[PDB]
């Protein structure tokens, strides 16, 4: 993921990028959505606005990692791509890592709405005018948000750090599956059992 040269916004806060494959984590979550350019900034941990407030709120004590790369070739067709919605009205804010897909007509005023839009009663959702010809900042940005939790379960995802060759007949340091030591390694004639 790091040496990809194709991700615009490979940056994240909880942990260092170089030590990702150094810690064995629990079951990593992965989120996915498409968003404009102006607000990839507020997908970061701890911001407020329109999308960070009613759509996808990220906790302050965040330890995941955030991805964002431009795709103005797959999610943008002539005449617009009226297939990517986003809520812009809500009773209150949104707790971190919360999902809401209800489509009850939002009531800004103090009058009954009877499930039909009218005076001071707006529809909750809104579409994206993803025209193929827009300035940068209006083009779609596919975003992936990761999350690393320290669950009391032992671990489920380690890192593929490294494995090197072995040189025999020398006094060298070694480490086999956590069993370290020093000495000289030579071929044996034992009768190990499979386990």
């Amino acid at each position, epitope marked *: 993921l790091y040496n990809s040269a194709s991700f615009s916004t490979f940056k994240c806060y909880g942990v260092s990028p170089t030590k990702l494959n150094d810690l064995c984590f629990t079951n990593v979550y992965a989120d996915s959505f498409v968003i404009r350019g102006d607000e990839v900034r507020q997908i970061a941990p701890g911001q407020t606005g329109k999308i960070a407030d009613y759509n996808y709120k990220l906790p302050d004590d965040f330890t995941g990692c955030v991805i964002a790369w431009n795709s103005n070739n797959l999610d943008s067709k002539v005449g617009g791509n009226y297939n990517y919605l986003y809520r812009l009205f809500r009773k209150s804010n949104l707790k971190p890592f919360e999902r809401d897909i209800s489509t009850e007509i939002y009531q800004a005023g103090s009058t009954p709405c009877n499930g*039909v*839009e009218g*005076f001071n009663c707006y529809f909750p959702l*809104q*579409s994206y005018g993803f025209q193929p*010809t827009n300035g940068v900042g209006y083009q779609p940005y596919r975003v992936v948000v990761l999350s690393f939790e320290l669950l009391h379960a032992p671990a489920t995802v380690c890192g593929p750090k490294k494995s090197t060759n072995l040189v025999k007949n020398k006094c060298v340091n070694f480490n086999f599956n956590g069993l370290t030591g020093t000495g000289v390694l030579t071929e044996s004639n034992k009768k190990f059992l499979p386990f």
Partner: antibody
Amino acid sequence: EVQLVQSGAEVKKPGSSVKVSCKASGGTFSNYGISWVRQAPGQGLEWMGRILPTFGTANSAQKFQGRVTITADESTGTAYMELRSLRSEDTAVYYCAKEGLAFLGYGMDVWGQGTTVTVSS
Amino acid sequence: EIVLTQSPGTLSLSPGERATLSCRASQSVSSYLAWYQQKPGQAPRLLIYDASNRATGIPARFIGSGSGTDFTLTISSLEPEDFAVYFCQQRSNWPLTFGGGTKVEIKR
């Protein structure tokens, strides 16, 4: 380049019923929000109401309450704006145009072609 | 029910000059407005939405500005294909009313 093919001219009589269609050229619907605009002969425009095809929601202007009934058929991508109790002054050119699945903001950009509806006797 | 007006009603200008149409509102419509350009015997088309943005394919000569309760559409270079009736539609809330109109003629 979404198109909106519309019906043809329909002369009617006072007190009768009319039904204008706004079939979407291209197949079925999407996150639309088609709205209906009426223009009197030699006058300004006048909004009437809007429908949400896929989300199944429709309403009309306060002045047109109890008279206009907008329905949609997502199977064929055709929206109807049946109007009953036609008056002598309801003669006009009726338009349909998509305005994005919303209520406020963008504004209608792709229009139909107009359906003259002269109501007399 | 918000009401809009456009001043003036005729705005007679010769080709090549600069136009100035003002769709002054009646309430807070801060940044929700759209301008339409209807040639006679045709369907209106969108020009300027959100009072600043320009719809796709529109030539850059069309510039819109203003906010709050007083907006303005300004045309820099009047081409022969710019003489029509210009409508303003407020999109604040129910219902989405319209404006009067301003038939821009040729000055001779």
